[PDB]
Amino acid sequence: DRELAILATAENLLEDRPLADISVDDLAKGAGISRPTFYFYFPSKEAVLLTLLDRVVNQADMALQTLAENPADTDRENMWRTGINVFFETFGSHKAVTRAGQAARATSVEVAELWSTFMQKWIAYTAAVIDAERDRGAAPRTLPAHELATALNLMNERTLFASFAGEQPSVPEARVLDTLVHIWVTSIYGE
């Protein structure tokens, strides 16, 4: 509807400017509506960002769910790679939303709780996979699985973000997936 035009306008404008440099008038103009009509679809520009981020986060979540139900016929290293690649490709395809969404964590309770809920879910799933690998004898019982899963997921969040943002320092985007896979596989399977 007009809602999709507002969202697409916001995502396009976030390529160039921070959210503080975008006005409600800018979003309405880009969507072909008046300022009061905008407020019928969203209560604020922050709510537009929250919706964009919610869509990106659930896109990753659903893709990870799909992988879980369709295990790829390949070795263990490639199975972890395909999982991390979900986050690499989903957030990497929406870099401006990812950037603005992490910035809004500091100021928005709703954004911070969205990130935290989905991080908790992904950590719990990671820990359950580690636990399953230990039970079948494929991985050694080293660190508590949930603590290991927490640090590896936090590593991914920080490292992918730095790569996408081109921060200094960062791992080049063309190298970050293999870097993370190496650290995940050695720390999960290494004695």
Q: Residue numbers of the site for its own copies (CB under 8 A)?
A: 103, 106, 116, 119-120, 123, 142-144, 147-148, 150-155, 157-159, 162, 167-171, 175-176, 178-180, 182-183, 186-187, 189-190
* Least spacing, CB of residue 111 vs its own copies, in Å: 14
User: Residue 147 binds which entry of its own copies, ligand 5TB, none, with Cβ cut-offs from 5 to 8 Å by kind?
Assistant: its own copies
Task: Kindly indicate which of the ranges 19-27, 70-78, 156-164, 171-179 contains the residues binding ligand 5TB, using the contact rule CB under 6 A.
Answer: 156-164
Going by the DSSP 8-state scheme, the letter that residue 18 receives in this structure is -
Instruction: Check whether the bond before 43 is cis (ω within 30° of 0).
Output: no
User: Residue 150 binds which entry of its own copies, ligand 5TB, none, with Cβ cut-offs from 5 to 8 Å by kind?
Assistant: its own copies
Q: Among positive and negative, which fits the CA dihedral 12, 87, 154, 173?
A: negative
| 83 scored as a contact of ligand 5TB (CB under 6 A) | yes
| C-alpha to C-alpha distance for 103 and 6, rounded to whole angstroms | 20
Give the DSSP per-residue string, 1-42: -HHHHHHHHHHHHHTTS-GGG--HHHHHHHHT--HHHHHHH-
- Comparing CB distances to its own copies, the nearer of 30 and 78 is 78
Going by the DSSP 8-state scheme, the letter that residue 103 receives in this structure is H
Rounded to 5 degrees, φ, ψ at 189 are -100, -10
Residues at the site binding ligand 5TB, with contacts judged by CB under 6 A = 80, 83-84, 87, 91, 98, 102, 119, 122, 125-126, 153, 156-157, 160-161
